[PDB]
Amino acid sequence: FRTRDRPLRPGDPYPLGSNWIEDDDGVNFSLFSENAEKVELLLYSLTNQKYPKEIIEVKNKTGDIWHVFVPGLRPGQLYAYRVYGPYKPELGLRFNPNKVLIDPYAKAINGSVIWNDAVFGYKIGDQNQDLTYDERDSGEYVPKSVVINPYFEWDDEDFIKGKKVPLKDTVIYEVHVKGFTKLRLDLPENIRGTYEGLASEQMISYLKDLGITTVELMPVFHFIDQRFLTDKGLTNYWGYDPINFFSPECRYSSTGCLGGQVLSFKKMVNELHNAGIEVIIDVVYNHTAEGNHLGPTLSFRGIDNTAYYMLQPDNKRYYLDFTGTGNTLNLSHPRVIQMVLDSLRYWVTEMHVDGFRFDLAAALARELYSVNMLNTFFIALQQDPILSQVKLIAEPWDVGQGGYQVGNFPYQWAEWNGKYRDSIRRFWRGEALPYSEIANRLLGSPDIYLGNNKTPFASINYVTSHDGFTLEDLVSYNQKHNEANGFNNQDGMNENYSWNCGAEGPTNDQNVVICREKQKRNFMITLLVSQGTPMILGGDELSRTQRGNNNAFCQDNEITWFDWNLDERKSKFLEFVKKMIQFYRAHPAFRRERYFQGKKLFGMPLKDVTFYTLEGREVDEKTWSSPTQLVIFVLEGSVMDEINMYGERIADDSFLIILNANPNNVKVKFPKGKWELVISSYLREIKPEERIIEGEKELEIEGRTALVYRRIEL
Amino acid sequence: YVPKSVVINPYFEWDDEDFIKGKKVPLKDTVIYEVHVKGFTKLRLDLPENIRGTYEGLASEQMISYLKDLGITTVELMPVFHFIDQRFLTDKGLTNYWGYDPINFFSPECRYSSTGCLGGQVLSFKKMVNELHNAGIEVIIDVV
């Protein structure tokens, strides 16, 4: 028989990908290819996945989209594609139907890659490398896509689609799905380090106790372990290397990789929303795990290489790399643009995601070679009805030339404030930066984001992230220790703006431990007292340590697992971060929607913020540009231009904050009021000269100490 | 010595089963597949026992996928009307395997059920049909 003797329907080229049509009993397959000449649908049995149990040729094509509707099939059916066409790598055409490809619209993938020189489309050994054409079948080594059933019952989950957590009052908590619960011997295994483990009653209660509002999850897009990681006994722990944009990772799931990864994800989000916790997901759209040339041929390169990938225009054999990871997705092609926003819309309307943190966000604005934030993809995202409502967070740079684009992302976009990261670490490190540099950071960095009409909550303040040290390692090391990575300690940035407190590594010396505990609390008070929306690094409340590894993308082991066993030193830091989060959330003078001016307002005798120096005298224009290790400012809570959504003014307590990074002691004369101690970084018992201050008193402030005060009388 | 009749609860929740009550399989394009409920799955060591040769065994994911792979459209089931083993078969160590010998016209056979003969035979039958219709398979029953 031929392809015409098994019953078929022409199908439709609408909803790209496999779509279970319950009413007609069958499945509709759709796949874009501008350049394919023949497209063949492969169907596998669950048992036999080395050869296809049936080969169907996609003969119908409406426009640049191939499609066929195969009767009898149900959800759960395994499938993959073969794309026939021209092979001219020096021109960009790398079509090899011997290599089995993965549906870019597959919403569930069964397993991952079995590395073998057959999944490459070019002779691995040959001297002419990626110009050659290896004819080995790779079907038995590449995972297959699953037709999923999209249906799901969201128990009173649609009511949180109303009054959400506004970014004004948000506290971000960056988590790795696996590390959150792998060493949670509390839970059973089989859910440890899984989606279900994250949404268990034990973790949900913990997250409300900690007090964070929303969770930001490291890449959950179904990703592949790199071969140069496999050939060193290593894994992709972070997962910033995906090949599919619609499948939740099968490695994070704990119910089944045959569609159970999308079920256990939806059930996970449903559990969090029933606890009033928003969900943001780290998302890679700038590059794909297929690498540059010499990389594998597992999907896009096979389906249509000159559409999906940015290729060097004069050769078109090599790949433009603005991510440092081999390739860069070509976001200038209409269907590539359609893919990303289809995926962005998919995770919102179907997986009920509340926001996205874009990895290397600038690389998405690359048109040929230059970054212009007025590209097609950003505009369409801005105008879209549903994507206009969820939060959009950017890593405001890529590793290209001219890629540093902080403050140039459109409004509605928030940005990771790297300038806040670096200068705050240097301030407490000991360096003396201008009074105007750190004071700007503390008031939401208006110098950055005001020029493009943005707000203080648009600035994402953070002192540590998954890139670089953790907070414990930040006060415990001065140099990288990525020796365990297997790259001869050449990977991961060298300047971390780090300081050890008096060692490098673990220590017994009792001054080194304390300088840190004081330094850890010094960072914590700074972050949650500055204007903007703060991001906590996951595990930092637990004083998590990566053994001095500032680049633990490859370590899926005890280095990156969360250590839940707490001693007395760790337990009391947890209560500190708890009470500091509880503080920041209780006081609107730090959850501000508009910036502080330097003025009295509403006809009041105090100006909304005042800056002092060692003596209670106001900061001048020449003190404001001189360097400093001590910065003093008074937030007048009752004279803020802060108005809620109902037209009411807000106002808060009046606060005075002392940040003295000078290693030596300094004496400070207070302003005119009677001030009360609310929190400080002192580990020692707070003696009563310091608890209440009256009438322009002077007070000894030990070196490297942060203090918060509240005026009780004027 | 004679079995007793059970007052049953007729209620049953047919999950999206009422939509196949529309575009069905017209006889023009039908392919009939005559099955014995027991013989279909008794030696199906794939499935657990306790459902081998039962209604539930017939509607299991293993058999449903097999019937779509074979390609038949509707299933024709040998007599499922609750029947009695003839005495001249009993007095030779034998049974009524086909079952073309019933005494009740409303009870699904208790010998084919695998959940309970106290009303479980009518539940496990409705659940069996519901599973087939969710797979686009029509059901015809041999009736005496």
Question: Residue A578 is encoded by which pair of tokens?
Answer: 């708890």
A21, A25, A27, best to mutate vs chain B, most B CBs in 10 Å? A25
Evaluate whether B78 touches B99 at the Cβ level (below 8 Å). Answer: yes
Which tokens in the block code for residue A480?
A: 């990288």
DSSP A445: -
Tell me, yes or no, if A23 comes closer than 8 A to chain B by beta carbon: yes
Q: Which residues pair with A680 in a beta bridge?
A: A707
Q: CB distance from B135 to chain A under 8 Å?
A: yes
Using DSSP bridges, classify how beta strands A87-88 and A93-94 pair: parallel, antiparallel or unpaired. Answer: antiparallel
Q: How many whole angstroms separate alpha carbon A466 and alpha carbon A560?
A: 10
Determine the Cα–Cα distance for residues A27 and A443; give it in Å rounded to an integer: 55
Of B42, B41, B45, B73, the residue nearest B59 (C-alpha) = B41
| Torsion angles phi and psi, residue A690, rounded to 5 | -95, -20
The residue extents of the domains of chain A are 1-149, 150-594, 595-714
Residue in the structure block whose two tokens are 């939509």: B19
Contact A520, A475 (CB under 8 A): yes
Q: Which residues of A touch B135 (CB under 8 A)?
A: 25, 74
Partners of A72 on chain B (C-beta within 8 Å) are 68, 71, 136
Structure tokens at B86: 């003839």
Q: Is B4 on the interface with A (CB under 8 A)?
A: no
- The edge-to-edge listing of strands for the beta sheet with A78-84 is A54-58, A38-44, A78-84, A144-146, A109-110
How close does chain A come to B72, measured CA to CA in Å?
10
What does this entry list as its resolution, in Å?
2.8
Q: Hey, which residues of A are catalytic here?
A: 359, 395
Taking CA–CA distances from A75, the nearest residue in chain B reads B135
**C-alpha B21 chain-centroid distance:** 20
Instruction: Give the separation between CA A413 and CA A455, rounded to whole angstroms.
Output: 10
User: To probe the interface with A, which of B18, B67, B69, B131 has the most A CB atoms within 10 Å?
Assistant: B69
Q: Which two tokens stand for residue A344?
A: 């962005």
Question: Coil, strand, or helix at residue A516?
Answer: helix
Residue A159 near residue A120, CB atoms below 8 Å: no
**How far apart are the two ends of chain A, measured CA to CA in Å?**
95
Pairs of CB atoms within 8 A across A/B: 14
CB A157 within 8 A of CB A91: no
Tell me the residues of chain A between 59 and 98 that have a Cβ less than 8 Å away from chain B. Answer: 72-74
Q: Which of A493, A547, A502, A498 is nearest to A523 (CA)?
A: A498
User: Closest Cα partner for A484 from A564, A563, A553?
Assistant: A553
Inter-helix orientation angle A568-586/A510-527, to 10°: 20
* CA–CA gap between residue B51 and residue B57 (Å, rounded): 5
Which two structure tokens, joined as six digits, stand for B136? Answer: 């686009």
Determined by X-ray
Measured CA to CA, the distance from residue A629 to residue A652 in angstroms comes to: 28
Pairing of strands A214-217, A278-283: parallel
Q: Which of A704, A593, A707 is nearest to A657 (CA)?
A: A707
Instruction: Find the DSSP H helices in A494-567.
Output: 510-527
Which chain B residues contact residue A150 at CB under 8 A?
none
